[PDB]
C-alpha cells in the first residue's frame, strides 16, 4: 500500500512516501523537476530506484525542509532507500554496497575563536 523512510543530510529532512504508481514524483506540491532542473545533481536522489529498477513501480510524495537544496537531494536519496528497504527487507543486500542507506554525518565545522572560519588562520608577517 504505502511505505516510508526518513533520511537526513546536513541539517535537512525529507519525508519519502512511496506508493505503487505510474512513477511520477511530487515534492512540496511541486513536480520533481519544477523544484530541481537547473540543479544537475538532482537525479542522484532517485538512484535507489534505479539500483533495484523501481523506476516505474512507485509514485512518490515528498516533503522537504531544512538546509539547502543539495543536502535535500541527498536527504531524498536516503528516504527513498529507507522506504525501499521497508517494502522488501531483501533489498538491503542489494542497497548496502552502494551505501545509499548510509547517513552522511559531515556537518559544518563550528567556527573557532582566533581563526577566521574554524580552520583558516589570520596571516602574519614577522617583519
Partner 1 sequence: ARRRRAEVRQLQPDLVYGDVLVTAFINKIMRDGKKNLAARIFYDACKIIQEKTGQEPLKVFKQAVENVKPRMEVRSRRVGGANYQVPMEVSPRRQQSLALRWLVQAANQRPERRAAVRIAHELMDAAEGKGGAVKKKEDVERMAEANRAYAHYRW
Partner RNA sequence: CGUUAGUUGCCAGCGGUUCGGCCGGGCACUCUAACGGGACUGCCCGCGAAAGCGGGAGGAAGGAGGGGACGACGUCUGGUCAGCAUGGCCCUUACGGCCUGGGCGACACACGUGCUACAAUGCCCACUACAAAGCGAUGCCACCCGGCAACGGGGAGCUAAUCGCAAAAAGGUGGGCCCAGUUCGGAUUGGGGUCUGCAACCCGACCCCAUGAAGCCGGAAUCGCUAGUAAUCGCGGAUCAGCCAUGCCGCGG
**Binding interface with RNA (CB under 7 A):** 2, 6, 8, 10-13, 15, 17, 35, 37-39, 61, 63, 65-72, 92-93, 96, 99, 101-127
Q: Name residues whose C-beta falls within 8 Å of residue 119's C-beta, 6 or more positions apart in sequence.
A: 109, 112
Stretch that binds partner 1, among 11-19, 20-28, 35-43, 59-67 (CB under 8 A): 35-43
Stretch that binds partner 1, among 22-30, 39-47, 51-59, 83-91 (CB under 8 A): 39-47
Q: Which residues of 2-23 are buried (b: 16+ CB within 10 A; e: fewer)?
A: ebebebbbbebbbbbbbeeeee
Smallest gap, in angstroms, from Cβ of residue 123 to partner 1?
20
The grid coordinates of residue 104 equal 552522511
Amino acid at each position: 500500500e504505502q511505505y516510508y523512510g526518513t533520511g537526513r543530510r546536513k541539517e535537512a529532512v525529507a519525508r519519502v512516501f512511496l506508493r505503487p504508481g505510474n512513477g511520477k514524483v511530487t515534492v512540496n506540491g511541486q513536480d520533481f523537476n519544477e523544484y530541481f532542473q537547473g540543479l544537475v545533481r538532482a537525479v542522484a536522489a532517485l538512484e535507489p530506484l534505479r539500483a533495484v529498477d523501481a523506476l516505474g513501480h512507485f509514485d512518490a510524495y515528498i516533503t522537504v525542509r531544512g538546509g539547502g537544496k543539495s543536502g535535500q537531494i541527498d536527504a531524498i536519496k536516503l528516504g527513498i532507500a529507507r522506504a525501499l528497504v521497508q517494502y522488501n527487507p531483501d533489498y538491503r543486500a542489494k542497497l548496502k554496497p552502494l551505501g545509499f542507506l548510509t547517513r552522511d554525518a559531515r556537518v559544518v565545522e563550528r567556527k573557532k575563536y582566533g581563526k577566521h572560519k574554524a580552520r583558516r588562520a589570520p596571516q602574519y608577517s614577522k617583519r
